[PDB]
């Protein structure tokens, strides 16, 4: 089995309630001897049987635009995952108070990063399943990694399970059909969100109406600061067929591509 790496609990010093909280955690970095971290805590059935099966999952998979997991703390009460600490929070909220200040160059830097995380996400054959801005962290310099925050504040965004329909493609919202495609869908809303400043895709719109129009075809309207190239990556993420969208690796060549070259 996958060993998952320890974390004493006393080398944990818990701050700040960010269910989970800022710490500083010591024994850990290579260099600086306390550094800041994220770290979430919970105990039910299959509670510590999915923490323990997720940590195994954090534990190898990790790239620079994944949230980077340290590791388990303790000997389980509780149940304690150690995450870096992202000064500036998650994406969704962040595009939000960066709005009506965000230029061009900046959204595809977020874009491209996200992208890349997806295309490292892709060859891992994992997917995401609720990829959205409120799923992303920001940290310095405009760093973005994607995690996965589980479905509060964002429980409009979800639907009574509980899905992010309007992140989702019509074969996911018909036959729970979720694979890298279905990602890529996602990802074109993202897009969206980032250049309308972390608005709600179909705001006007009801659940049960976001189900229809999805499975009609219709798709999200350009926002006025998207140029159009970024909405044509957009519109090859929502391909009514799977098989006819863009996939990640390409739509992050372009991203990168703009980004490299936007003043
Ligand atoms: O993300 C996951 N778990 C998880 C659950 C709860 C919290 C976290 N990590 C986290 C959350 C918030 C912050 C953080 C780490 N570091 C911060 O700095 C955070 C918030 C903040 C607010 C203001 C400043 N910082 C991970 N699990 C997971 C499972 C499968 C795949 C993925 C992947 F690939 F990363 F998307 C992922
Ligand atoms: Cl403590």
Redesign the pocket.
């Known amino acids: 089995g996958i060993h998952v790496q320890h974390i004493k609990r006393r080398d944990i010093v818990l701050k700040r309630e960010?269910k989970?909280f800022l710490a500083e955690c010591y024994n850990l970095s290579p260099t600086k001897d306390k550094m800041l971290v994220?770290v979430?805590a919970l105990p039910t059935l299959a509670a510590r049987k999915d923490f323990q099966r997720?940590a195994e999952?954090?534990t190898n998979?990790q790239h620079e635009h994944?949230?980077k997991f340290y590791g388990v703390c303790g000997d389980g009460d509780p149940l304690i995952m150690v995450?870096?600490?992202?000064?500036?929070?998650?994406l969704n909220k962040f595009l939000r108070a960066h709005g009506p200040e965000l230029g061009l160059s900046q959204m595809l830097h977020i874009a491209s990063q996200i992208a890349s995380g997806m295309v490292y996400?892709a060859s891992q054959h994992?997917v995401?399943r609720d990829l959205a801005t409120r799923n992303c962290?920001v940290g310095a310099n405009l760093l973005v990694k994607?995690?996965?925050?589980?479905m509060d504040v964002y429980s409009t965004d979800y639907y009574r399970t509980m899905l992010p329909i309007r992140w989702m493609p019509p074969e996911s919202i018909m036959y729970r059909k979720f694979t890298t495609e279905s990602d890529v869908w996602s990802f074109g809303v993202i897009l969206w969100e980032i250049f309308t400043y972390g608005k709600q895709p179909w705001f006007q719109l009801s659940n049960t109406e976001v189900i229809e129009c999805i499975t009609q075809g219709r798709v999200l309207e350009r926002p006025r600061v998207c140029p159009k190239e970024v909405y044509d990556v957009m519109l090859g993420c929502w391909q009514r067929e799977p098989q006819q969208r863009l996939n990640i690796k390409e739509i992050y060549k372009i991203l990168h591509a703009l980004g490299k070259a936007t003043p």
């Open positions: 960010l989970v994220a979430k997720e999952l954090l998979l994944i949230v995450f870096e600490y992202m000064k500036h929070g998650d996400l994992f995401h962290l994607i995690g996965d925050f589980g």
